[PDB]
């Protein structure tokens, strides 16, 4: 429960979990947008992927995820992670350190088809997009 392959958008001491990618959303202004991209390319996955949001998580990640929206402005298609990855045994976890919500999930085995998905962290008027890509390594 140490390494979380994800994005930590919070600021305080994340003592329990340590994330690979960090960008404190409180350090940017309303004219800024945080973009955090995670890529997973291995034959068999055993990775714990998650998120640390100090505001509101959209949608109900990671049970729900947004279909990635290139171009446009913000995503709008809600899909379910079990159908987007097409694997029938995924663990879902959640924890909260103060006002910071942490949403995780655990992948085991190989992924049939390379897919990607987006989760949104909105704090006040600022938004941070976490985009994950999981390769099939076919």
């Amino acid at each position, epitope marked *: 429960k140490k390494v979380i392959h994800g994005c930590n958008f919070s600021s305080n001491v994340s003592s329990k979990y340590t994330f690979t990618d960090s960008l*404190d959303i409180s*350090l*940017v*202004d*309303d*004219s800024a*947008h*945080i*973009s955090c991209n995670v890529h997973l390319s291995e034959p068999k996955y055993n990775h714990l992927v998650g998120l640390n949001c100090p505001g509101d998580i959209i949608p109900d990640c990671f049970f729900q995820v947004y279909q990635p929206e290139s171009e446009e402005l913000e995503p709008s298609n809600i899909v379910y992670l079990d159908s987007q990855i097409n694997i029938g045994d995924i663990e879902y976890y959640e924890d909260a350190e103060g006002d910071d919500k942490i949403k995780l999930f655990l992948i085991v085995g190989s992924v049939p088809k390379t897919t990607s998905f987006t989760c949104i962290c909105k704090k006040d008027k600022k938004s941070a997009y976490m985009t994950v890509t999981i390769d099939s390594a076919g």
Partner: antibody
């Protein structure tokens, strides 16, 4: 309360090196997830982006200008500088420093337009 | 890299008229387009970010319209102090690129 201010000579002779320095007050460069860039505007012409630098020291340049361009940062004094070697009359412009974001192709990046600008200083390239 | 095509170059409109400035991107910049107002002798002032959102302290008469590559800036009723040169800029990717600008004169 963030304030940027350019400083440097406003008259440089041709084929020499133009130097400018931006001083940041009201905020710390080493704590900032933003990039620190330089934009110039020739008299009666449009705006041109030169390059930016992160508190790493990592620099990004407009490709057609990478050979003459050099941007450096000094986090212990909240300053970042610009070096333009082999100047010509085409380099006579008002030069601005500004805080802005990064590029899309990056892994973890702030996407933001230039919000805080300097006052701008005119540099005349002439003999 | 990404060419910003702004039009018109000049613009003359009386006080209280509706003024629209357009901007077109070479390729898709998503929604990362900004609008700047530059008075003479001053640095450009950021007016609009992410195509639609207004900077704080900006009068309500300014607005933006985002799309894939076509963008708009509109003033609902002009004021005397609105004369300036307006630039669009994409901050989608490096290198940053600007439009030719639009010099707005108020007709009287």
């Amino acid at each position: 309360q963030l304030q940027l201010q350019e400083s440097g000579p406003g008259l440089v002779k041709p084929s020499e090196t133009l130097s400018l320095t931006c001083t940041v007050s009201g905020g710390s460069i080493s704590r900032s997830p933003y990039y620190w860039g330089w934009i110039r505007q020739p008299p009666g012409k449009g705006l041109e982006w030169f390059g930016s630098i992160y508190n790493n020291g990592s620099t990004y340049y407009n490709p057609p200008l990478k050979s003459r361009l050099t941007i450096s940062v000094d986090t212990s004094k909240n300053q970042f500088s610009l070096k333009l070697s082999s100047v010509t009359a085409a380099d006579t412009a008002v030069y601005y420093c500004a805080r802005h974001g990064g590029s899309t192709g990056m892994k973890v990046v702030v996407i933001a337009p230039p919000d805080y600008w300097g006052q701008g200083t005119l540099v005349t390239v002439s003999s | 890299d990404i060419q910003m095509t702004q039009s018109p170059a000049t613009l003359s409109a009386s006080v209280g008229d509706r003024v629209t400035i357009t901007c077109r991107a070479s390729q898709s910049i998503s929604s990362w387009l900004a609008w700047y107002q530059q008075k003479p002798g001053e640095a450009p002032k950021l007016l609009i970010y992410k195509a639609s959102s207004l900077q704080s302290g900006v009068p309500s008469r300014f607005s933006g319209s985002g799309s894939g590559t076509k963008f708009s800036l509109t003033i609902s009723s002009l004021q005397p102090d609105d004369f300036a040169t307006f630039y669009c800029q994409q901050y989608h990717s490096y290198p940053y690129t600007f439009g030719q600008g639009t010099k707005l004169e108020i007709k009287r």
